[PDB]
Copies of this chain bind each other. A is one copy, B any other.
Amino acid sequence: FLGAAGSTMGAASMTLTVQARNLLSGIVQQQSNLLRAPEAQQHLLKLTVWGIKQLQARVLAVERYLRDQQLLGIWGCSGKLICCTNVPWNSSWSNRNLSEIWDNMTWLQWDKEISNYTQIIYGLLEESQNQQEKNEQDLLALDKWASLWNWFDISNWLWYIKL
């Protein structure tokens, strides 16, 4: 857990050759202590201090661990820890070297690199995930899969596989 967070992303390519260095299972499975005993107590005590504080911490962790699942759902990446997108690296102005990034830069320094435009990227991603990709998929079924291919106007299929 977090075991190579200080490493560079090339030595934290090591982190995502393992389970993102166990980050997600440490997110949901560090609940196991307050999961093991909110109920082993058989005591009256007539009032509860943790009855609001532990509950607020618990549902805070749950909503935080669902917003990210919904955001991976909204970019077609649901289930997949590492997925790629149709959004290009745009005019976004931290254009730099590949062998600088994935060899000599930590994840935290990388967060300091692109601390701006992060909401720009998050707004940008679903655009290519949905507004044309879902509409192309909606086009792709309102034509018989094996009946159009005689016209010699087959590019539409080619167009949907290159652009």
List A residues at the B interface (Cβ < 8 Å): 17-19, 24-25, 28-29, 31, 35, 38-39, 48, 51-52, 55-56, 58-60, 62-67, 69-70, 73-74, 76, 78-82, 84, 126, 130-131, 134-135, 137-138, 141, 144-149, 157-158, 161-163
In the complex, residue of chain B having the shortest beta-carbon distance to the beta carbon of A67 = B28
A-B contact pairs, 6 of them (CB 8 A): A18-B131, A24-B70, A31-B63, A35-B63, A62-B63, A146-B161
Give the copy number: 3
Which listed residue (B38, B39, B62, B80) contacts A62, Cβ 8 A?
B62
Chain B residues near A82 (CB-CB < 8 A):
134, 137-138
Known contacts A18-B131, A66-B28, A141-B84: does B56 contact A59 (CB below 8 Å)? no
Chain B residues near A73 (CB-CB < 8 A):
69, 78-79
